Symmetry: C2
Subunit: 36 residues, 2 copies
């Protein structure tokens, strides 16, 4: 199962945003596997 | 200025997650321009 990406906010440090990016990228790699 | 990506949640429909992905991708394209 894909992990739920934790979102601290948009005011959060960009490294946290990057971490979310990677987690969401993996999340979509799982969910939207060759879809959308 | 980069737009603050709205996060409805991880239980939200994946199309909303994809939208966040694009907005966050653009956000990082602005912020982390050839950085991190």
């Amino acid at each position: 199962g894909p992990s739920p990406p934790t979102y601290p906010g948009d005011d959060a440090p960009v490294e946290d945003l990057i971490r979310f990016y990677d987690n969401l990228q993996q999340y979509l790699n799982v969910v939207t596997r060759h879809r959308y």
